[PDB]
Amino acid sequence: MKFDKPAGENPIDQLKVVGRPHDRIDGPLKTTGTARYAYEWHEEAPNAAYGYIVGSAIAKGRLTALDTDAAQKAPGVLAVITASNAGVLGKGDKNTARLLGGPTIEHYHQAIALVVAETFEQARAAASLVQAHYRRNKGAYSLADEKQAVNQPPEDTPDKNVGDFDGAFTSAAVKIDATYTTPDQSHMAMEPHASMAVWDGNKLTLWTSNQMIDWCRTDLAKTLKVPVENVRIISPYIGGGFGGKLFLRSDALLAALAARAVKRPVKVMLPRPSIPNNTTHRPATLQHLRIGADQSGKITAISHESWSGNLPGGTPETAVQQSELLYAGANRHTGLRLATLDLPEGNAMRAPGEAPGLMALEIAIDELAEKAGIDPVEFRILNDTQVDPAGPTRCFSRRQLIECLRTGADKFGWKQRNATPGQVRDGEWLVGHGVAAGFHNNLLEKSGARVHLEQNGTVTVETDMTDIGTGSYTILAQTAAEMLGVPLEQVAVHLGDSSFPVSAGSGGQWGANTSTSGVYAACMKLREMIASAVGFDPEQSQFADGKITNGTRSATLHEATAGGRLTAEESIEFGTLSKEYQQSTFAGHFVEVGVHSATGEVRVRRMLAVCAAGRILNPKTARSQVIGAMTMGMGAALMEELAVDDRLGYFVNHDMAGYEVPVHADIPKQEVIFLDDTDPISSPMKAKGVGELGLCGVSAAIANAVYNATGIRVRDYPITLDKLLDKLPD
C-alpha cells in the first residue's frame, strides 16, 4: 500500500475499538512478574554463562596492553573477551563510538573486556582482576570552552536564512538577546541494557532490550561480519528506552562475541554505574536567541543558533529546527555549531533537538512577551503561522496550537495568574504560574505486518514493532479488531522478533502511526481474502460482530477459514505528503509551581498538558505517555544534570543516586487533554505521535512558572535552589 493522497472514509472511522481507552493487553503479564525481559529467559538457555564488562578507566588515549591472566585463573572463569582476541570487527551505521575499544580509547567507560564465568558473582570478582594499561592523550571536555572556536555549521547542515534578520532586528520596536544552556542528560531507563546470545553453528539468536529490531539485526551482523539472515533478534518486553536503546550497545556485541568463543550461551547486563558513560547521553547545548517584534507584538525577526559537542562524526543536538516552524516572522536565521568533545557519545534522548530547543525558545518568548506588555498566551496566538514561514505556499496539514493554548488557559484558570511576579504566597511558598508551547514533527516511515484469521475465529498480529512501555501491543490489537469486526480480546499480538515483518520501530514518535498503518494495510488485504472465500465483493462488504455482510448476503468469519487459515502480509509506504504539507504536532503546557521563600526549593503544584497529535488511538495509554513525559520534563527543569569533570573527561555523578530523576513525592496533579486533531494527510489511521511531543515545552513552562513565582530568570538548566537563593526575599 502506497499512501500518497489524503485518507478518505475507511473502516477505522467507526471507532468501535480504536480511539477507546482499553486496558493494556500486556497488563496481566507486567503486574504479576511474568513478562520476560532480556536477562530473564532461563528456559531458552538454562546453563547460560555470565558476562561482566570492563570499562575504560581513562577518557581518551591508547590501550597499550590489557592483561587477562589473573582473571582467566579466577574461580569459575571460562574466557575473557578483548579487542585483540575477538578478531576484526565491522562497525554498525548507528554507532559513532566503537562498542569494543582497544587499541584506541574513545571515551570513559568504553568497554574493553568481558569476563565470562559460571556465576554472576564469579564474573564480577574476576572482572576486577583485568589489568588495563593506558597512554593518555589530550582531550576536550568543555562545550563552553570549545564554543569560541566554532562559528561555521557542518558542511552538510548549512544555516537557514530567510529575509533580512539583522535589518529587521535593528528596526524592531521590542527585542531580546539572550543565552540559554541545557546540560548533558541521561536516559536512566529502569531496565539496564542487557542481552543473551545463543549460537547454533553460524546462526545467532540474541534476546535483547532494543527499540529498533531491524536496525539491531543489521548492525549486529555488520559488526560481527556475518550474513544478516543468520541473526535473529528477540525483544518482546523492553523496560524503557527513551532513545537510549535505539541502537546496538556493547551488551549485545559482547554477549554475541562471548557466546561464540565459549560455545555456550552467555548473558550480559551493563551494570548501572557504568551506563551513563558507557552508553549515550543527550548532548548539552548552548543556545543564542535574538527575537524582534513590532509595535503590535508581531514577531519580525528570529535568530536561533545552538552549540553542541560530540565525538568526531557524531550527531549535533538539533536544537534550532522548531524555531524554523513554530512562530511567525518574515526574517529568520537558524544555525547549528558542532564542537568535538571527547566525552561519551552524544545521541538521541526523548525529543532530540526539540526538548532542549524549546527549553530555550519558550523562555525567550516568555521574556519578549513580558517586554511587549502582552500576555504570553496571547503573544503566541498572535504569532501563529498556519504555513511554513520559509515557504508560505507550504501549509501545515493540521495545526491547533491556538486551540491548545486557549483550551489550556480556560481549563487551567490562566486568568487567575498575577502578571507581576513575586506577589502570591501560600504560607512560606511563593506561588507561580507559567506557560509554554510544545512542538514536534510527524515523521513517516515504511512499516509492515502479518495478520492471520485463525480457524477458531481469533486474529493473530505479527510485526517486529516494539512496545517499550508505549502501548504498541494494545493499539495494534485495537487496529486489527477494528478492521476485522472482532472484539479486542480475540486478537493475539506478537512483537519484537526479527522473524516477523519489518516495522518502523519505536522511535521519532512515528511508531503508533506507522505500525498501526501497516496493520491497516495487512487487514485490508485480509478483508479482501475473506470476502473472496465466501464469494462476496470486497468493496461492498462490511465486517462486524464476527461476521461479513454484503448487501442482503451475510457469512460468518468461521466459514471463511473452513478451508484453512487466511494470512495476509503487507507494508504501508509513504509518498510526498510530508513534502507537500508540513506535518507536525502541538501542545500547550500550563504549570503552577511553589518556591520556598527561604530555601529556594522548587515543588510543582499542578500541571496541565493540552495536546494535538492526530487521532488518539488509545486515550488511556496516550494520557500515560504525556504524564510520563511531563514527569521527565520536571526532571529536566529542576534536578537532572550529568556533571562533567573538565579535567578527567567523564560524567561524575554516573548513577541512579547522583543523577536525580523525579520520585513519587515530586509529582503533582497532572491533567491531560487531547484535542480532536484527526489528520487525514498523515496516514489511513489519521494519527500522529505523542510520546515525544508530551515532553516538548514542559521544562520551559516550569522555568516560566519559577519566574512568575520569584522574579528570577534562570537560563542555565536545571533550575536548582542555588541558582535562586541570593535573589529571594528575606
Partner: protein, 173 residues
C-alpha cells in the same frame, strides 16, 4: 593478583509459601537468589545499589530492597515476591487496580511498586509515621501526601506515578 573461591553454604528459605533448599555463594544477594538460583524473575534489578526499589520484596511481611541484603542472612525467612501476590488468572486486588488505572508503562518498576504499595498500606494501619506526618504522636491517615512519600523509594522513569497513586487509593478504599 587473585580473588578467593566462592564460599558455599546450605540455605533454607520459604518463598511464596514454598520450602526451598539451596546451596549458595555467600555473596549472593536475596535478589540474585530469586532471579538466578530460583528463576523467580518477577523481582527486577534496576540498579543493584538500593537506589531504585525495583527489587522490592517482603521478608516476614516487611518490605526491603533484595539487592542490599544477603540470602544467607534470611535463613528460615518467609519471602514474598510479586509472583506470590497473584498471577494472570488470579490477580491480587492491587495488581488489578494497577491495570485499571494504567499504573505502569514499561513494566520494569511495577513488581516493586506493587510489593511496596501493599506493605505501605500495612505500615499506615500499623501506625508508622512518615516525613509528611504532621502530628507525630497521633496515628497517620491514608492520604495522598502520605502514600507519595512512603512510595518515593520506588522509582518510575516512565513517570507512571500519578496513575500509581490512583491505583493505590482505589485498592485502599
Amino acid at each position: 593478583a587473585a580473588t578467593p573461591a566462592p564460599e558455599i553454604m546450605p540455605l533454607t528459605l520459604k518463598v511464596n509459601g514454598k520450602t526451598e533448599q539451596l546451596e549458595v555463594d555467600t555473596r549472593t544477594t536475596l535478589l540474585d537468589t530469586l532471579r538466578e538460583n530460583l528463576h523467580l524473575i518477577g523481582t527486577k534489578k534496576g540498579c543493584d545499589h538500593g537506589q531504585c526499589g525495583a527489587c522490592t520484596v517482603l521478608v516476614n511481611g516487611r518490605r526491603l530492597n533484595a539487592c542490599l541484603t544477603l540470602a544467607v542472612m534470611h535463613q528460615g525467612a518467609e519471602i514474598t515476591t510479586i509472583e506470590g501476590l497473584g498471577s494472570p488468572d488470579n490477580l491480587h486486588p492491587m495488581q488489578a487496580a494497577f491495570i485499571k488505572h494504567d499504573g505502569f508503562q514499561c513494566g520494569y518498576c511495577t513488581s516493586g511498586q506493587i510489593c511496596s504499595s501493599v506493605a505501605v498500606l500495612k505500615e499506615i494501619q500499623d501506625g508508622i509515621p512518615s516525613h509528611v506526618t504532621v502530628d507525630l504522636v497521633s496515628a497517620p491517615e491514608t492520604t495522598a501526601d502520605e502514600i507519595r512519600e512512603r512510595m518515593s523509594g520506588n522509582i518510575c522513569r516512565c513517570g507512571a506515578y500519578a496513575n500509581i497513586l490512583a491505583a493505590i487509593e482505589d485498592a485502599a478504599g
